[PDB]
């Protein structure tokens, strides 16, 4: 595609403007990372329950973090912000989104339909309608076109690792999505085949295996600890044969850096 | 489910 490079450059320009604040959680007086992790985990179930695209999920998480970057939110209203975000994401990415009623339904009438509709409106003001955010999922898609041959266990597993990173704001909030996606691809490739971050992609991204190292270290930890984590929605998801069961594969015990 |  004649624009495929332009897109990549343009996605790299946009990821910097869509960045949440680094340490927003600690000026947030009533909530924390641990409860952000419960929310996001919940969002994975809602996506599975309604057969949403993975992208809708990445989008919603971007909106939530950007919103919590400038608004204090009480714990009893956290789920409302998340549920409004998943609605906007679905409206943006899905061919036909689930009705508001269904979004009200998954909360157990913990909020009313109007409350959701007013939150949608509030989220839209705060993000000033900037909904077209680049996501780890997007860069992975671009990176996959540089694999020989196409190996779909590596694709599934790189997706899987990128989803895990949604759950924990510390540390993953301090990496751009292009970096997390690089780290996930290397790690997935390394794990299935013993291969390495290809030259084609170093040339494309200007990212050496060496500049991935800090993020690749974290993702190795995460991958290793994954069966132990409080949140398990994602592992549940990636056991499906639809993902070639990559959630079941054994992480390697060293990165060999 | 409700949730925190």
């Amino acid at each position: 595609p004649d624009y495929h490079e332009d897109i990549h450059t343009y996605l790299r320009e946009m990821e910097v403007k869509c960045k949440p604040k680094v340490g927003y959680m600690k000026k947030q007086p009533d909530i924390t990372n641990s409860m952000r992790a419960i929310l996001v985990d919940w969002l994975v179930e809602v996506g599975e329950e309604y057969k949403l695209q993975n992208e809708t999920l990445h989008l919603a998480v971007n909106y939530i973090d950007r919103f919590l970057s400038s608004m204090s939110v009480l714990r009893g209203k956290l789920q409302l912000v998340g549920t409004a975000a998943m609605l906007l994401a679905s409206k943006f990415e899905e061919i036909y989104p689930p009705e508001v009623a269904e979004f009200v339904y998954i909360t157990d009438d913990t909020y009313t339909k109007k409350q959701v509709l007013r939150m949608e409106h509030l989220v839209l003001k705060v993000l000033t309608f900037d909904l077209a955010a680049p996501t780890v999922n997007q860069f992975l898609t671009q990176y996959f076109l540089h694999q020989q041959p196409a190996n779909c266990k590596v694709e599934s597993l790189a997706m899987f690792l990128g989803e895990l990173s949604l759950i924990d704001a510390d540390p993953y909030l301090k990496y751009l999505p292009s970096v997390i996606a690089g780290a996930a691809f290397h790690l997935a490739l390394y794990t299935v085949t013993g291969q390495s971050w290809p030259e084609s992609l170093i040339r494309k991204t200007g990212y050496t295996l060496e500049s991935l190292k800090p993020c690749l270290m974290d993702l190795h930890q995460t991958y290793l600890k994954a069966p132990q984590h409080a949140q398990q929605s994602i592992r549940e998801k990636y056991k499906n044969s639809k993902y070639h069961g990559v959630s079941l594969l054994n992480p390697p015990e060293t990165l060999n850096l | 489910r409700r949730x925190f």
């Binding site: 004649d2 996605l11 992208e55 943006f92 508001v100 309608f129 900037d130 077209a132 | -």
Partner: protein, 295 residues
């Protein structure tokens, strides 16, 4: 909102009535689009979500400028630059004489520049047609109506039952491909290009199936040599009549060799070989382009 005065309704569209309005303090003229925030339905519709967020990234002389977005409790107003009519109306008021060729050439040149700008910004328009192109009285033309436009950072999944007006639909969509590509915008545009020249819709079909056969009668039935993979396509049927490519000079009489050369590359069957908007701007057809004003 208090600073706007409505002048007249200028037609209906995706989000309902469009007004011409004037800013009471700067003197500016503006098209207002009004979305009714029904607090009982579905919230902001997805057409507004997409048009607002996409149009705010797209800044180009050949894409309509979104000037402002006005929020209240119960209303969302969109404020666009004002353009007094669309291609469709210009073409009906131009029937009989036809649109002069230098104006066709200028318009197509401008439209390809806006499209190239969308595509290089990961935006598919998705719904190009004479109704969604606007003109001023100085000879500009602009892509408008981004209500169906999609970001393709991840390839965009097609509708199981296309909602979008038969006549400008690419063959790969009609044969039920899984994803759109930028190629679908090029095909629409090739159609509009022919329509401006001939004064008539290039492929005026009645049903999804009749749309396909009207394309096959003019371009000839595609086969695996022309289109590697056609026969593998979901909606492909072996019982398709096997028509032979008809003669391109009889499809668009009033066009020189460079016109037909470009137009036929915008109508290549295979989405992978259809010329991109970027490469179309380098076509010799635009070597003598200028900027005339319409009457």
């Amino acid at each position: 909102m208090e600073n706007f005065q409505k002048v007249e309704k200028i037609g209906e569209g995706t989000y309902g009535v469009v007004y011409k309005a004037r800013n009471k303090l700067t003197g500016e003229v503006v098209a207002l689009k009004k979305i009714r925030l029904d607090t009982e339905t579905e919230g902001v519709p997805s057409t507004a979500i997409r048009e607002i967020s996409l149009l705010k990234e797209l800044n180009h002389p050949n894409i309509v400028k979104l000037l402002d977005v006005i929020h209240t409790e119960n209303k969302l107003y969109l404020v666009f630059e004002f353009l007094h009519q669309d291609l469709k109306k210009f073409m009906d008021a131009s029937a009989l004489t036809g649109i002069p060729l230098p104006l066709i050439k200028s318009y197509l040149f401008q439209l390809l520049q806006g499209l190239a700008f969308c595509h290089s910004h990961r935006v598919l328009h998705r719904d190009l047609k004479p109704q969604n192109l606007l003109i001023n009285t100085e000879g500009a033309i602009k892509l408008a109506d981004f209500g169906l436009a999609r970001a393709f950072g991840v390839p965009v999944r097609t509708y199981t039952h296309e909602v979008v007006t038969l006549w400008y639909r690419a063959p790969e969509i009609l044969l039920g491909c899984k994803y759109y590509s930028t190629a679908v915008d090029i095909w629409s545009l090739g159609c509009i290009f022919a329509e401006m020249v001939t004064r008539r819709a290039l492929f005026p079909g009645d049903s999804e199936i009749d749309q396909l056969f009207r394309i096959f009668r003019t371009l000839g039935t595609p086969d695996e040599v022309v289109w590697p993979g056609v026969t593998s396509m979901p909606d492909y049927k072996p019982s398709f009549p096997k028509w032979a490519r008809q003669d391109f000079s009889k499809v668009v009489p009033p066009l020189d060799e460079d016109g037909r050369s470009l137009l036929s590359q915008m109508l290549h069957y295979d989405p992978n070989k259809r010329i991109s908007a970027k490469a179309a701007l380098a076509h010799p057809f635009f070597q003598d382009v200028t900027k005339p004003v319409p009457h």
